[PDB]
Amino acid sequence: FCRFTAEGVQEIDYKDIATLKNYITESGKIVPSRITGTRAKYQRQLARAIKRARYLSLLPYTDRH
Amino acid sequence: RKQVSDGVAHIHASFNNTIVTITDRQGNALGWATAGGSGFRGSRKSTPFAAQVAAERCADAVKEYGIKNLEVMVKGPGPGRESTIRALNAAGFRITNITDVTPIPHNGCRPPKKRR
Amino acid sequence: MKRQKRDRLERAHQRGYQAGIAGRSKEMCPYQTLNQRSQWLGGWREAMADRVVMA
Amino acid sequence: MQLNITGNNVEITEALREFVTAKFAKLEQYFDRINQVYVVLKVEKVTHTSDATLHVDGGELHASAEGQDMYAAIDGLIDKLARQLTKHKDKLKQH
Amino acid sequence: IKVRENEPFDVALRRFKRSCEKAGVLAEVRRREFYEKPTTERKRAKASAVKRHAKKLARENARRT
């Protein structure tokens, strides 16, 4: 697999939900790094970005809201 | 009797029983039938067939409300949960969408310790 | 005194089905020949669904 | 449960039969419904040994105990039988 | 989970995603806090993972069939 955050020179911001919605599933759950194949550092930055965007309601926690 | 059009079919599908509550869009109940009250008792409650007979004995006694189409909510990881919605395809209904309302806590309260 | 019943082909099926239901999520107690391993695993995966439908 | 006593070279006195019978009755009452019990007493020049065969619903079960004075052997045999009975009893409870 | 689509639908997709993530987390969380044996069961699970991978890898020599 490939790590798209490694293909860029990025440091994951929590506001590009166009990219973060590629890493939530349709139940709101964060997709594993063995599935997406991201590096572990961008996986941690990814998880903090998902949870932060959930806090600002740019992403849902679940699908039963 | 109210002459309702569409309904929401909640199916509580625990291990020891399945109860089927057909309500309306609003969320207040029209009729229910359980896998215990259909003649099946004790361990025999915990079968998919008793859930199927439950969905039958709900799908009539909601005839007087005149429901053409219903959604299906299913809560509970039980032995029914699929035979009871085959028994709602077969009961003469139009299934709009099927959801899952099984409550998954982002682990909160502590579960019991039960087995040895 | 007569000959073997269903010559390991669909006996290999029901061994994989009983072993599928009674746990054993190894899928690592089969035969080794192909025509019997294929449906030991066939009965195993037909037994996972029959474990989901019950307790 | 009827207890049958027999003896090879051991003269079964009446005080000997009273004690053995009491011990067997006590064991039968404590562990399981027992249909019939055969007791064999052997003396081989040193070893006071005892055999017992209990016929219970599951089937036969047997034990054997060597002792010093016959009484000791009987006690050992009865304890062994009780242990065997516990195994058979919940072996056929096994809920 | 959420299935709505056109006239061939309603069973296979739903029992797939429903069955996997539902039966997983509910059959897990239904009892047993344990506090101690997710540590043991993950340790045994992953030691069995590396033993199965290396065991099949060095078991890829021959079998005399």
Place this chain on the structure above:
Amino acid sequence: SITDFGIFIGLDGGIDGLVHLSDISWNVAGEEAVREYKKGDEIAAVVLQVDAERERISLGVKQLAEDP
């Protein structure tokens, strides 16, 4: 190919599965026991009488012959 006490299981024509039932087989219903009446591995008269599109059951027959 294999007669299983309620039929004969003709399976020619590229994988079409289970076929003729014990009920036709002759002009007698119940007593017939197909091993007595036809064969093992033999090519016969059998005509279709039903193809069920779902559940993959064609149901051929053998009574369609000339005895009555």
Place this chain on the structure above:
Amino acid sequence: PRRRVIGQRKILPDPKFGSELLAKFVNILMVDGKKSTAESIVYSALETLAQRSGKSELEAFEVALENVRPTVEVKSRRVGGSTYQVPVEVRPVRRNALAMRWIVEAARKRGDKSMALRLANELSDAAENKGTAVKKREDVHRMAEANKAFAHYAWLSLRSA
């Protein structure tokens, strides 16, 4: 057994009528290893079944038989502590033999004077859906249909025919 789909042998048909089902029926009440007097009981009973029914004898016996042949049959199973009965479908070889065993037992009851009169009356009420073997048939269907909620694992009646 564990092994052996066994090399099966067939039977001789009945002499007086072209039937092997009838010869099996003679072998059911052929008590004590004696075929001839069982044949006299069967013939003596089908004659008065013809006179007490009007219609022919082979169709009289077969119409009298299909009201006691079963469809579902219980099999007692235990899992854990429970020991519930699970409905298996009867295979159509076992079906009519399981009917004739009930006819012959219900004729060994019911006691009239002669065995041909007992079996003749029992086949008559089997045509009438009235006697004992129809009560046993309906007992088997009531308890298999009552325990109908069990269709499971592998210990009974694999995929289809």
Place this chain on the structure above:
RNA sequence: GCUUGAGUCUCGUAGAGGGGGGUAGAAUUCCAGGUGUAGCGGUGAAAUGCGUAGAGAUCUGGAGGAAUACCGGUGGCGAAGGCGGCCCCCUGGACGAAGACUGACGCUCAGGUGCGAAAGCGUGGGGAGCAAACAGGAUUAGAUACCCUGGUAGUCCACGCCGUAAACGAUGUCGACUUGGAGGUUGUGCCCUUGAGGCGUGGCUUCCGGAGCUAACGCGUUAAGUCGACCGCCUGGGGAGUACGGCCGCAAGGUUAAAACUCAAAUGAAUUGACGGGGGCCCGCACAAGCGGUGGAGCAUGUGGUUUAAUUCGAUGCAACGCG
């Protein structure tokens, strides 16, 4: 004096490291209200329990407490205990690149001091869920238990105490040297970053194996290999980490620590069997599907017992009892 050991400074880097504060969502419970009615709940089966006084279910609202799904990774950080939502404030350590600086400032450490899971104790709050004690229902020959229905301390917070754990890597700390492989994580250098590329370089870590070692199991550059410095500890099993005395503690108790007596063993690892209410596979009148019996009766025959002058002797689970 010197700079290699040690330490300091300039840049960054990652991290559930710690203390304080705040906040978010799901779920559980309760309360109020609506719809609705005959069951719910639970088990291997059941009952105790709750429900026609309207339960269980479903919807709306509110309260309160606790834990933070997914990410979650034989991943990370910490001296150890341990630390998982998210944000802020205060703060410790580690790592690497390039230099500069001090100049042996180092290692270990009895006594001492500090930290130290859970349970527990004291004071004051708080109490959702769970849950010792306790009640009840089962189960059982009995069942002060496992199973079920409830349920109080406790679990939570603030401040003190206790100072023990299978506190485990059952492996003291520091340093040097000694073939390899596959990975993880975290920096960094060069070159065609021209493509998730190639070649090196440090740290931490997981597994497999080399010599070597070990009683074997196994350890194996993160050694249980080869050595060096310092400390703790052991000297047969039971008595016993117990008694008496000291010290600490509110107590529970912790630490230090015997002896009389008694035995010729206790033990570690591995082996061959046997066994398991361990597993896999195959088979058997083993079960299932049936037919006919035994056990009730009379009689025959054998045995035990009792009797007798003697009731000759032997055979006694299966494998003695129409047996010699």
